[PDB]
Short mmCIF file of all heavy atoms in Angstrom, two decimals:
data_model
loop_
_atom_site.label_atom_id
_atom_site.label_comp_id
_atom_site.label_asym_id
_atom_site.label_seq_id
_atom_site.Cartn_x
_atom_site.Cartn_y
_atom_site.Cartn_z
N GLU D 7 6.53 -57.48 21.61
CA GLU D 7 6.43 -56.17 20.95
C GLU D 7 5.86 -56.35 19.53
O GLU D 7 6.15 -57.32 18.85
CB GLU D 7 7.81 -55.52 20.95
CG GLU D 7 8.93 -56.38 20.28
CD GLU D 7 9.10 -56.17 18.83
OE1 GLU D 7 8.41 -55.23 18.29
OE2 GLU D 7 9.82 -56.94 18.14
N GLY D 8 5.09 -55.33 19.09
CA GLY D 8 4.57 -55.34 17.80
C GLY D 8 3.09 -55.57 17.75
O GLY D 8 2.48 -55.82 16.67
N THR D 9 2.43 -55.49 18.90
CA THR D 9 0.98 -55.71 18.91
C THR D 9 0.18 -54.49 18.53
O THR D 9 0.79 -53.43 18.43
CB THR D 9 0.52 -56.26 20.27
OG1 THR D 9 -0.81 -56.60 20.26
CG2 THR D 9 0.72 -55.12 21.34
N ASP D 10 -1.11 -54.65 18.43
CA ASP D 10 -2.01 -53.55 18.21
C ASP D 10 -3.30 -53.87 18.92
O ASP D 10 -3.83 -55.04 18.82
CB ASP D 10 -2.27 -53.28 16.72
CG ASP D 10 -3.10 -52.03 16.52
OD1 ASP D 10 -2.58 -50.89 16.72
OD2 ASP D 10 -4.28 -52.16 16.17
N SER D 11 -3.90 -52.91 19.58
CA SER D 11 -5.13 -53.13 20.40
C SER D 11 -6.06 -51.89 20.21
O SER D 11 -5.94 -50.93 21.04
CB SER D 11 -4.75 -53.33 21.90
OG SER D 11 -3.68 -54.27 21.95
N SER D 12 -6.95 -52.01 19.29
CA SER D 12 -8.00 -51.02 19.14
C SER D 12 -9.30 -51.69 19.38
O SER D 12 -9.48 -52.87 18.89
CB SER D 12 -7.97 -50.32 17.81
OG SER D 12 -9.23 -49.74 17.48
N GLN D 13 -10.24 -51.07 20.06
CA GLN D 13 -11.47 -51.74 20.51
C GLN D 13 -12.67 -50.80 20.32
O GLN D 13 -12.52 -49.72 19.73
CB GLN D 13 -11.40 -52.25 22.00
CG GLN D 13 -10.22 -53.19 22.29
CD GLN D 13 -8.91 -52.42 22.46
OE1 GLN D 13 -8.83 -51.17 22.21
NE2 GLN D 13 -7.84 -53.20 22.70
N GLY D 14 -13.79 -51.22 20.88
CA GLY D 14 -14.97 -50.47 20.96
C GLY D 14 -15.74 -50.20 19.66
O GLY D 14 -15.41 -50.71 18.61
N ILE D 15 -16.68 -49.31 19.75
CA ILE D 15 -17.48 -48.82 18.62
C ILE D 15 -16.54 -48.42 17.43
O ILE D 15 -16.81 -48.68 16.33
CB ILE D 15 -18.42 -47.67 18.99
CG1 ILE D 15 -19.20 -47.99 20.21
CG2 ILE D 15 -19.27 -47.29 17.81
CD1 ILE D 15 -20.16 -49.23 20.00
N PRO D 16 -15.36 -47.67 17.79
CA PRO D 16 -14.35 -47.44 16.78
C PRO D 16 -14.10 -48.66 15.85
O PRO D 16 -14.27 -48.48 14.62
CB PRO D 16 -13.12 -47.05 17.59
CG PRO D 16 -13.67 -46.39 18.70
CD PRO D 16 -15.07 -46.93 19.03
N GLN D 17 -13.75 -49.75 16.42
CA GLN D 17 -13.54 -50.94 15.56
C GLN D 17 -14.79 -51.32 14.83
O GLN D 17 -14.76 -51.59 13.63
CB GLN D 17 -13.02 -52.10 16.45
CG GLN D 17 -11.60 -51.86 16.93
CD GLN D 17 -10.63 -51.78 15.79
OE1 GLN D 17 -10.14 -50.72 15.48
NE2 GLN D 17 -10.37 -52.94 15.15
N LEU D 18 -15.93 -51.36 15.48
CA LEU D 18 -17.14 -51.79 14.91
C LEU D 18 -17.47 -51.01 13.61
O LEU D 18 -17.58 -51.59 12.53
CB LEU D 18 -18.32 -51.72 15.91
CG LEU D 18 -18.19 -52.57 17.15
CD1 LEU D 18 -19.22 -52.28 18.14
CD2 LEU D 18 -18.21 -54.07 16.70
N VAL D 19 -17.53 -49.71 13.76
CA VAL D 19 -17.65 -48.83 12.60
C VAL D 19 -16.54 -49.14 11.56
O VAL D 19 -16.83 -49.44 10.44
CB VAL D 19 -17.69 -47.39 13.03
CG1 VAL D 19 -18.13 -46.46 11.86
CG2 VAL D 19 -18.63 -47.19 14.13
N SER D 20 -15.30 -49.13 12.10
CA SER D 20 -14.14 -49.42 11.18
C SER D 20 -14.27 -50.74 10.46
O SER D 20 -13.65 -50.94 9.45
CB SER D 20 -12.86 -49.36 11.94
OG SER D 20 -11.74 -49.25 11.09
N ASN D 21 -15.04 -51.69 11.04
CA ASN D 21 -15.31 -52.90 10.28
C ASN D 21 -16.23 -52.67 9.14
O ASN D 21 -15.90 -52.93 7.96
CB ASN D 21 -15.83 -53.95 11.25
CG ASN D 21 -14.78 -54.48 12.20
OD1 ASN D 21 -13.66 -54.68 11.86
ND2 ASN D 21 -15.25 -54.64 13.44
N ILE D 22 -17.42 -52.13 9.42
CA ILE D 22 -18.45 -51.99 8.47
C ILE D 22 -18.04 -51.33 7.20
O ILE D 22 -18.14 -51.79 6.10
CB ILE D 22 -19.73 -51.29 9.03
CG1 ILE D 22 -20.48 -52.29 9.98
CG2 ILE D 22 -20.65 -50.75 8.01
CD1 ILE D 22 -21.41 -51.55 10.93
N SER D 23 -17.40 -50.14 7.41
CA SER D 23 -16.89 -49.31 6.34
C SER D 23 -16.08 -50.11 5.35
O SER D 23 -16.33 -50.02 4.17
CB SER D 23 -16.11 -48.17 6.92
OG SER D 23 -15.21 -48.66 7.94
N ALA D 24 -15.17 -50.96 5.88
CA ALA D 24 -14.28 -51.76 4.98
C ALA D 24 -15.13 -52.56 4.01
O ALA D 24 -14.93 -52.42 2.72
CB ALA D 24 -13.37 -52.65 5.82
N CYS D 25 -16.10 -53.31 4.53
CA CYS D 25 -16.98 -54.10 3.66
C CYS D 25 -17.54 -53.23 2.61
O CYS D 25 -17.54 -53.57 1.35
CB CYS D 25 -18.08 -54.74 4.51
SG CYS D 25 -19.38 -55.51 3.55
N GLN D 26 -18.06 -52.05 2.95
CA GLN D 26 -18.72 -51.19 1.99
C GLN D 26 -17.87 -50.96 0.79
O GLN D 26 -18.32 -51.15 -0.39
CB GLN D 26 -19.07 -49.83 2.68
CG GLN D 26 -19.60 -49.94 4.07
CD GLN D 26 -20.56 -51.12 4.25
OE1 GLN D 26 -21.65 -51.07 3.67
NE2 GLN D 26 -20.16 -52.10 5.01
N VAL D 27 -16.61 -50.64 1.00
CA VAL D 27 -15.62 -50.39 -0.10
C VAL D 27 -15.79 -51.44 -1.12
O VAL D 27 -16.07 -51.16 -2.31
CB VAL D 27 -14.20 -50.31 0.51
CG1 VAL D 27 -13.17 -50.40 -0.62
CG2 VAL D 27 -14.01 -49.09 1.31
N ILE D 28 -15.58 -52.70 -0.67
CA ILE D 28 -15.53 -53.78 -1.69
C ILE D 28 -16.79 -53.81 -2.65
O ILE D 28 -16.62 -53.90 -3.80
CB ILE D 28 -15.35 -55.18 -0.95
CG1 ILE D 28 -14.07 -55.12 -0.13
CG2 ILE D 28 -15.30 -56.31 -1.98
CD1 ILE D 28 -12.79 -54.93 -0.91
N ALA D 29 -17.93 -53.62 -1.96
CA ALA D 29 -19.19 -53.69 -2.75
C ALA D 29 -19.18 -52.67 -3.83
O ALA D 29 -19.60 -52.92 -4.97
CB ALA D 29 -20.36 -53.56 -1.84
N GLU D 30 -18.76 -51.43 -3.55
CA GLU D 30 -18.89 -50.37 -4.52
C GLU D 30 -17.84 -50.59 -5.61
O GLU D 30 -18.04 -50.01 -6.68
CB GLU D 30 -18.69 -49.08 -3.87
CG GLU D 30 -19.83 -48.61 -2.89
CD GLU D 30 -21.05 -48.27 -3.59
OE1 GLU D 30 -20.97 -47.60 -4.70
OE2 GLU D 30 -22.21 -48.51 -3.06
N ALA D 31 -16.91 -51.44 -5.43
CA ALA D 31 -16.02 -51.83 -6.52
C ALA D 31 -16.73 -52.61 -7.55
O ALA D 31 -16.22 -52.68 -8.73
CB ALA D 31 -14.81 -52.58 -5.95
N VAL D 32 -17.78 -53.34 -7.27
CA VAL D 32 -18.41 -54.29 -8.16
C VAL D 32 -19.93 -53.91 -8.28
O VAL D 32 -20.73 -54.76 -8.52
CB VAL D 32 -18.19 -55.66 -7.73
CG1 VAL D 32 -16.75 -56.08 -7.95
CG2 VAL D 32 -18.59 -55.83 -6.27
N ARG D 33 -20.27 -52.62 -8.08
CA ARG D 33 -21.62 -52.19 -7.92
C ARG D 33 -22.40 -52.04 -9.23
O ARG D 33 -23.49 -51.50 -9.30
CB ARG D 33 -21.66 -50.89 -7.14
CG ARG D 33 -23.04 -50.30 -6.73
CD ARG D 33 -23.08 -48.77 -7.21
NE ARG D 33 -23.39 -48.66 -8.62
CZ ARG D 33 -24.56 -48.84 -9.19
NH1 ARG D 33 -25.59 -49.23 -8.51
NH2 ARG D 33 -24.69 -48.64 -10.49
N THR D 34 -21.87 -52.65 -10.38
CA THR D 34 -22.53 -52.41 -11.67
C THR D 34 -22.57 -53.72 -12.48
O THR D 34 -23.13 -53.64 -13.58
CB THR D 34 -21.73 -51.41 -12.42
OG1 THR D 34 -20.32 -51.56 -12.27
CG2 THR D 34 -22.12 -50.01 -11.97
N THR D 35 -22.18 -54.86 -11.94
CA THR D 35 -22.00 -55.99 -12.84
C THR D 35 -23.30 -56.75 -13.09
O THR D 35 -23.78 -56.84 -14.24
CB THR D 35 -20.95 -56.94 -12.24
OG1 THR D 35 -21.59 -57.75 -11.20
CG2 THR D 35 -19.83 -56.20 -11.70
N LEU D 36 -23.89 -57.37 -12.06
CA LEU D 36 -25.01 -58.25 -12.24
C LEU D 36 -26.19 -57.48 -12.79
O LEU D 36 -26.30 -56.28 -12.73
CB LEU D 36 -25.31 -59.05 -10.96
CG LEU D 36 -26.19 -60.32 -11.08
CD1 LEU D 36 -25.47 -61.41 -11.79
CD2 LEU D 36 -26.69 -60.74 -9.69
N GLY D 37 -27.26 -58.22 -13.29
CA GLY D 37 -28.31 -57.63 -13.96
C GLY D 37 -28.19 -57.70 -15.44
O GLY D 37 -27.03 -57.41 -15.94
N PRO D 38 -29.20 -57.96 -16.22
CA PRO D 38 -29.05 -58.19 -17.67
C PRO D 38 -28.47 -57.01 -18.39
O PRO D 38 -28.40 -57.06 -19.62
CB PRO D 38 -30.44 -58.54 -18.09
CG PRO D 38 -31.32 -58.36 -16.93
CD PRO D 38 -30.43 -58.46 -15.70
N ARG D 39 -28.10 -55.91 -17.73
CA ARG D 39 -27.23 -54.92 -18.38
C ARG D 39 -25.81 -55.48 -18.50
O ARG D 39 -25.30 -55.71 -19.67
CB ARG D 39 -27.23 -53.65 -17.56
CG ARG D 39 -28.41 -52.70 -17.95
CD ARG D 39 -28.47 -52.39 -19.50
NE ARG D 39 -29.65 -51.57 -19.71
CZ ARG D 39 -29.62 -50.24 -19.80
NH1 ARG D 39 -28.50 -49.51 -19.68
NH2 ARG D 39 -30.81 -49.61 -19.99
N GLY D 40 -25.14 -55.69 -17.38
CA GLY D 40 -23.86 -56.35 -17.39
C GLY D 40 -22.67 -55.52 -17.71
O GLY D 40 -22.70 -54.89 -18.80
#
Side-chain angles (χ1 to χ4, degrees):
Chain D
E7 54 90 9
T9 189
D10 186 74
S11 316
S12 160
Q13 304 76 0
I15 308 298
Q17 289 296 108
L18 294 174
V19 190
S20 196
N21 290 318
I22 283 162
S23 45
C25 168
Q26 319 320 293
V27 165
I28 301 299
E30 293 286 325
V32 290
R33 184 230 80 72
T34 44
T35 79
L36 197 67
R39 275 306 176 93

